[PDB]
Design a protein around this ligand. Structure first.
Ligand SMILES: [Ca+2]
Ligand SMILES: [Ca+2]
Length: 270
């Protein structure tokens, strides 16, 4: 039927597996993940139609107070594949064997169909994220010698952490058209190493395809981390960070109607 998770009714941390064939190995995992909201009024609800495959998120939050203003954004309601290292949730029923070492993975395309409707000027992005960890099956967080990589294919009013390194051009596909797209590369120290690729021409809705290794190769190339090839690419998460400390009302709706990961016959790291 329809899988539904809701904040605050299901608790602090609503989330659920998507396990179509009931094999106890989910294909994807969804979380509302309001991880820097200490208190708010209102609600956020995510539903997944097990027939149409449509994930739909509706958020009407007000009177927001953050856990830690220095963490900047409010949360990252999302769907992911792989092992998310901040908790015991995972989804590994898919064609890409995450978690695996970067040095052992082949490249893959990530294709997402979506439509974003932030309301009232709300700062948001639509960002794909992966964590790279010393341990494949981490469930308790991230250490200072590990990495977070984000790829922002939409943003309005939000800036990545840290500082701008350079611009790169990556061949991507936008609504069926091959596009050589420019991304700004940003790098931060926030408790671990962070690298974000923020596209220069953000895409508010449609179907976007990226070659994942174009981004992980650059993140490897610019890393300050030692023994980068020891790292496991844990997962691929897709969601919307939203809000800054200026934001006390965050009303947002979106839909993601397909996620596909397509293996390629070439290494991840070029
Ligand atoms: Ca399954
Ligand atoms: Ca709003």
């Amino acid at each position: 039927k329809v899988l539904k998770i809701r904040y605050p009714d299901d608790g602090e941390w609503p989330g659920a597996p998507i396990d179509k064939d009931g094999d106890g190995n989910p294909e994807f995992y969804i979380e509302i993940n309001l991880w820097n909201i200490l208190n708010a009024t209102g609600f956020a609800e995510m539903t997944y139609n097990l027939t149409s495959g449509v994930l739909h998120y509706v958020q009407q939050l007000d009177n927001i107070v953050l856990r830690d203003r220095s963490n900047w954004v409010h949360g990252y309601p999302e769907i992911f594949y792989g092992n998310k290292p901040w908790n015991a949730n995972y989804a590994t029923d898919g064609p890409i064997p995450l978690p695996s070492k970067v040095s052992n993975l082949t490249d893959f395309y990530l294709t997402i169909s979506y439509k974003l409707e932030p309301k009232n000027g709300l700062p948001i992005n639509f960002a794909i994220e992966s964590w790279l960890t010393r341990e494949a099956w981490r469930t308790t967080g991230i250490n200072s010698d590990e990495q977070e990589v984000m790829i922002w294919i939409y943003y309005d009013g939000l800036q990545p952490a840290g500082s701008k390194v350079k611009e790169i051009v990556v061949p991507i596909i936008v609504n069926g058209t091959p596009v050589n797209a420019t991304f700004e590369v940003w790098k931060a120290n926030i408790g671990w190493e962070y690298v974000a690729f923020r596209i220069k021409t953000p895409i508010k809705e449609g179907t976007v395809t990226i070659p994942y290794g174009a981004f992980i190769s650059v993140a490897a190339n610019i890393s300050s981390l030692p023994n980068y090839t020891e790292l496991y690419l844990e997962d691929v998460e897709i969601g919307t960070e939203f809000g800054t400390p200026s934001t006390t009302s965050a009303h947002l709706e979106w839909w993601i109607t397909n996620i596909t990961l397509t293996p390629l016959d070439r290494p991840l790291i070029s």
